[PDB]
Paper text:
The flavoenzymes provide an interesting example whereby very few deposited structures have had their redox states verified during or after data collection. The ‘butterfly bend’ of the flavin (the dihedral angle between the planes formed by the pyrimidine and benzene rings of the isoalloxazine moiety) depends on the oxidation state, with the oxidized form being flat and reduction inducing a bend along the N5–N10 axis. Any discussion of enzyme mechanism deduced from the structure clearly needs to be in the context of the oxidation state observed. Furthermore, X-ray irradiation, through photoelectronic effects, will perturb the redox state in the crystal.
The photoreduction of the flavin in an FMN-containing enzyme during X-ray data collection was followed by Røhr et al., showing the flavin bend. We also observed this effect in crystals of PETN reductase; Fig. 3 shows the difference between the yellow colour of the oxidized enzyme and the colourless X-ray reduced form, and the spectra from the two crystal states. By monitoring the crystal spectrum after varying X-rays doses we were able to use a multi-crystal strategy to obtain a minimally reduced structure and compare this with the X-ray reduced structure, showing clearly that caution is required when interpreting structures that have not been validated with spectroscopy. If the spectrum from the crystal (or irradiated portion of the crystal) is monitored during data collection, it becomes possible to be confident of the redox state of the structure being determined. There are many examples of structures in the PDB that are described as having a particular oxidation state but have most probably been reduced to a greater or lesser extent during data collection.
Author numbering: 2 to 364
The structure:
Amino acid sequence: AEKLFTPLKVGAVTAPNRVFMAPLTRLRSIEPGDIPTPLMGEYYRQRASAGLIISEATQISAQAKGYAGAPGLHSPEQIAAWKKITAGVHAEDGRIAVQLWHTGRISHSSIQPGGQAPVSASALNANTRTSLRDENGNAIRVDTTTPRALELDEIPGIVNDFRQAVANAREAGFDLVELHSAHGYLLHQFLSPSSNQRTDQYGGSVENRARLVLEVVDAVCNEWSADRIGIRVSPIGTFQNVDNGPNEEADALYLIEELAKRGIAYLHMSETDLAGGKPYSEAFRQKVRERFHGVIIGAGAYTAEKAEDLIGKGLIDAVAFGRDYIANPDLVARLQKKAELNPQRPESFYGGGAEGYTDYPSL
Ligand SMILES: Cc1cc2nc3c(=O)[nH]c(=O)nc-3n(C[C@H](O)[C@H](O)[C@H](O)COP(=O)(O)O)c2cc1C
């Protein structure tokens, strides 16, 4: 097929194809310590023919943690383990970005430092569930704990934690960093009027709601380089953990314009929740494309045909596939050859071990 398999310059690195591996939480890290494993290194290595791998969401700090089994990038042991994973990808001539998150109110007190309430823009429960582990280490669901609103004087420490995690990612050998500003996590909790009822300079107006994410962007650009920074947004639609308010399109375009001023490597748009949503209109895609001067990655139930169509139209540059990458380590070769895909086994997307993780065969 015609443009999916051609190179693309993505900030400081060049992808040999446009078939990207979306960030995918798999909840297989070691506890205690939230440490990446050899098995996770093998999983990533198997996928290194991707144009770019974007890692599972990774904590910037202990406080960022909201899921048992999700890895961090804040401790020495975590840095050491990730260095190995990046070295494995590089040994197979791949490229890998770390997605960095703070889960905010999508968390539980039992996995917070001190066992205390998690933090958010406002003290409003997400009214959803997260994943913990039981006494045998198996993934279980638990209702989210009501959070504590961050005090104004705590906000600089959040920005610093993102900055430090990006410094640690560089040390760890990642090619790029993806800020997780999507899916109702901390940055999005500030962005959304649904989850942010603050009356300080971090709530109310769109400019106030985007203030935190833009401070984080600035801090990480300064720490490393703008051509090493990507951002994931999900600014249109209703996600499990939050909606985008009553002026979603205008607010999205405001944010995107701001992000472009920073000259960052990429804009990754998660277009719908797993549960579905209204498709992006081509008019809205044009409006995004004229505001952002870097690479645009599209995601959300894409097929190869839709990817080619929108790439051919000059509307996006690359596609991130999530579940097809879970099941097909050599998704690039399969798409290039129009080969059949392995069937997905959703029961093993979260937790467990090798089964449903490293046992999906290549051609
Ligand atoms: C098991 C699983 C875990 C995911 N984990 C994350 C994540 O860590 N970060 C994130 O931004 N999105 C995550 N997503 C969303 C995916 O990155 C992707 O946007 C989504 O699966 C839709 O694309 P698909 O139809 O190609 O699977 C996850 C999706 C699934 C199914």
